[PDB]
């Protein structure tokens, strides 16, 4: 949009003044003029998503000063770098694995659902998690397992007892902990809040079950086999 | 932005009319005039999120009368209190709780994916559910299993046979239904769309297993112990 206007001097006849008034009135009245476009813009803007869920590039929102992940209650996607920062106390219970936080909006700004997924470098370690937050309070984190490539994960190069997460794996090339002659299996591990445990290992070579339990001792029991002739 | 203008009366000479026309012309033709700023706004608003996922503060949107969760077909966040949820004809079969509904857009408006997050500071109530919807039809609500604090959940103070949800728990302080001579254990439970059941319980002390089954129109059987010498 643009007016063509020339400044009118003492020498100009009433025709020239008339030309400029016509130029002004035409630009201001032409179909879909400045007025129509601005009334359309307002009507659009009242409908609009008047708050950011992403930055101006489509990237994560940054945030203010914090002490806990529940401090972020504005809706959006948020992300963290340095281990120097990533120290905070209301994080989920697993090692330093770095994250994106999504904050889901509810009825009130004091309450949100928080969703967590892991980052920085490498492959396997990730989880998905969620929780509900209200004022300062919350649920504990709820952890979701997922089958990589529609298959049970393969764990190798570790002692089978040092795995703490519940769930089903295929285990082979374990550096230790296994029953005699048992090289590999499915492992189904169960663990509670007291640190009771129930490990079921099944030997993939034969179909023999070996079960061992951990009490607050720190030690798993011997390998209780299934029964045989 | 603002024009400087003085109304011209029949007593004003042509010079006065010339001065006002020059004022109008200059304001409408200066650098960053009203036209340029409006062309900036159009070029920006065309790129925005043009309808609401949230209200203008970030909170859940408003919705009109629904009989069923399938009735909400706009993308966005909506709050649904427990008293409302209990009345919705396509609700999930659970204890009634406050929830947010998040709605995911598809190829069409007549179809949506729906995510429901339960809003409770109790880890035993907090759950995730989702489904696909088409017209009046849908899949069932898919319940998704998870580990509170990365552990198997802890249940207590109940008859064990009243526990119905498939999964793995630690069960302790159980009032009744347990195998004889057992006082706590890992419970593995499976239950189907016909109300067949399998419960495999292991005694936390000995590592003996016990199995019980329920037929569609029965209670459980007693606990069938593992094979012993």
């Amino acid at each position: 949009m643009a007016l063509n206007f020339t400044t009118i001097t003492e020498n100009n006849v009433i025709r020239d003044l008339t030309t400029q008034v016509n130029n002004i009135g035409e630009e201001l009245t032409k179909e879909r003029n400045i007025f129509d476009i601005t009334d359309d813009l307002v009507y659009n803007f009242n409908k609009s998503q008047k708050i950011k869920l992403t930055d101006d590039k489509g990237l994560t929102k940054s945030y203010g000063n914090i002490t806990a992940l529940r401090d972020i209650k504005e809706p959006g996607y948020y992300y963290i770098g340095a281990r120097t920062l990533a120290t905070l106390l209301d994080r989920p219970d697993m090692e330093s694995l770095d994250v994106v936080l999504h904050v889901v909006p509810l009825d009130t700004s004091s309450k949100v659902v928080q969703h967590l997924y892991t980052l920085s470098t490498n492959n396997n370690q990730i989880k998905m998690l969620y929780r509900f937050v209200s004022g300062n309070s919350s649920s504990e984190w709820q952890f979701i397992q997922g089958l990589p490539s529609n298959k049970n994960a393969v764990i190798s190069g570790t002692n089978i007892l040092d795995i703490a997460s519940p769930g089903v794996y295929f285990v082979m090339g374990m550096t230790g902990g296994m029953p005699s002659g048992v090289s590999s299996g499915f492992l189904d591990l169960s663990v509670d809040a007291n640190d009771n445990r129930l490990a079921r290992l099944t030997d993939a070579e034969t179909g023999k079950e070996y079960t061992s339990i951990k009490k607050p001792t720190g030690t798993y029991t011997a390998w209780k086999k299934e029964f045989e002739p | 932005m603002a024009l400087n203008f003085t109304t011209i009366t029949e007593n004003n000479v042509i010079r006065d009319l010339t001065t006002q026309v020059n004022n109008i012309g200059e304001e409408l033709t200066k650098e960053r005039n009203i036209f340029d700023i409006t062309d900036d706004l159009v070029y920006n608003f065309n790129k925005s999120q043009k309808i609401k996922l949230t209200d203008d503060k970030g909170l859940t949107k408003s919705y009109g009368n629904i009989t069923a969760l399938r009735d909400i077909k706009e993308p966005g966040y909506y709050y649904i209190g427990a008293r409302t949820l209990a009345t919705l004809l396509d609700r999930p079969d659970m204890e009634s709780l406050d929830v947010v509904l998040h709605v995911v857009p598809l190829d069409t408006s007549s179809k949506v994916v729906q995510h429901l997050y339960t809003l409770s500071t109790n880890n035993n109530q907090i759950k995730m559910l989702y489904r696909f919807v088409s017209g009046n039809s849908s899949s069932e609500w898919q319940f998704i299993q998870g580990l509170p604090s990365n552990k198997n959940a802890v249940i207590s103070g109940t008859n064990i046979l009243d526990i119905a949800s498939p999964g793995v728990y630690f069960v302790m302080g159980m009032t009744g239904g347990m195998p004889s001579g057992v006082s706590s254990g890992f419970l593995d439970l499976s239950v189907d769309a016909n109300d067949n059941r399998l419960a495999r319980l292991t005694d936390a002390e000995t590592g003996k297993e016990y199995t019980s089954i329920k037929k569609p129109t029965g209670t459980y059987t007693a606990w069938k112990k593992e094979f012993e010498p």
Binding site: - | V42, Y43, N46, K47
Partner: protein
């Protein structure tokens, strides 16, 4: 082998379903070799010469030539010394409507002024930079889509007052 009349009818219902992607285009602002007698149009062409701009199709519809008495009470259009009637997609085989009417009006200066000789209609046209408007100069077209139909006219002129309404009536097989 051969196509059929009703094949052409259903193909016309397909081109009418595309209508929103349809734009007038004008070009050839400099002379032919003879200005009274242009060269005949080459259907291997992909864009007009010396392109002046594009304008969205202000009308696209099925039509047919009008017939009496049964059209005497209908939606008549007048074009190129002939009288035509509008038809709707779900009736096209009952009426025998295999013809598509295509039209756009360039009001005054909403494309740059001066003479033009070529007139064409393109489908699948996509503009640059999120632009909403229905009048485009070449520097605001991203993909020209497909030049469906065109003609090599004598010149004409355009001024601030004069609307240039350009239009065609066409079928998918005019002549087998």
């Amino acid at each position: 082998a051969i196509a059929t009349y009703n094949s052409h009818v259903e193909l016309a219902k397909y081109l009418v379903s595309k209508a929103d992607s349809v734009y007038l285009t004008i070009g050839k602002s400099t002379p032919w070799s003879n200005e009274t007698n242009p060269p005949q149009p080459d259907e291997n062409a992909t864009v007009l010469q010396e392109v002046i701009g594009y304008k969205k199709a202000t009308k696209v519809t099925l039509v047919r030539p009008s017939k009496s008495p049964e059209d005497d009470n209908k939606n008549l259009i007048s074009y190129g010394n002939k009288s035509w009637v509008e038809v709707t997609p779900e009736n096209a085989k009952a009426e025998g409507a295999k013809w598509v009417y295509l039209e756009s009006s360039i009001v005054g200066d909403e494309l740059p002024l001066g003479t033009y000789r070529q007139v064409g209609f393109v489908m699948d046209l996509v503009a640059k930079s999120g632009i909403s408007k229905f009048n485009l100069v070449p520097s605001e077209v991203e993909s020209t889509g497909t030049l469906l139909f065109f003609d090599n006219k004598q010149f004409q002129n355009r001024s601030e007052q004069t609307t240039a309404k350009e239009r065609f009536i066409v079928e998918v097989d005019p002549n087998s």
